[PDB]
Symmetry: C2
């Protein structure tokens, strides 16, 4: 069963929360499908983003925050555990000091908190993926 | 009635052909939705691309070709006639010397042919849009 994409949900996070996302890129890596996960401070889609996670499948990952409507310092990663043509499971763990992004059960990306975790109220998952699971831990 | 996205169709083009695309970005420009239109040499999605047209809505446009599986010289445009939140009509006119991309009936982008027009056999339209029309002129 495919979930709506763009996928937008109300959330509440604290230390120990996990946001789990299972999906599949819509096309082969050769054509560079993208994935974007944005942790927003309000349900409104122009609200600030505590954690922006953008995957250029087969290429690289970009992370950032948008604070008072301004994009801040971009961080890059060349870690690329994602597998061409395959379903992936993202688990974004909310640690005290950072978000930690696991791909298939191992941590590959980290982003220290710039906006307090308690300010996050919405998550949006979008770009070139299908989605079968979006779960926030209880 | 919404068409499938990614949208992939067999085509045949010659001088005077028009490829018309009507669609709407899936989110507001503030969050930078994308649009990609690729004129391919075969139905296979890893085939070469005679004309790659990538819109960063609210930002800029990138055009290129992929020849023998290699991306060539990137050209940029800051022309941005697209309107936040609005349906657009793209008309890509196949001229003798170039592709000419009209937005709502006026030409804003041009790309001189690098691959012969007669080699184009497929068009793919994808990224963050909905689609209501894809028409190749008879």
């Amino acid at each position: 069963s495919l979930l709506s994409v763009p996928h937008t949900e109300s959330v509440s996070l604290s230390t120990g929360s996990t946001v789990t996302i299972k999906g599949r890129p819509l096309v082969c890596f050769f054509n560079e499908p993208h994935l974007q996960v944005d942790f927003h401070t309000e349900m409104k889609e122009d609200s600030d983003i505590a954690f922006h996670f953008q995957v250029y499948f087969g290429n690289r990952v970009v992370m950032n925050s948008r604070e008072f409507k301004i994009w801040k310092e971009e961080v890059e990663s060349k870690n690329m555990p994602f597998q061409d043509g395959q379903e992936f499971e993202l688990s974004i763990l909310v640690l005290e000091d950072k978000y930690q992004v696991m791909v298939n059960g191992q941590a590959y990306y980290n982003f220290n908190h710039r906006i307090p975790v308690s300010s996050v109220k919405m998550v949006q998952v979008w770009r070139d993926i299908s989605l079968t699971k979006f779960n926030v831990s209880n």
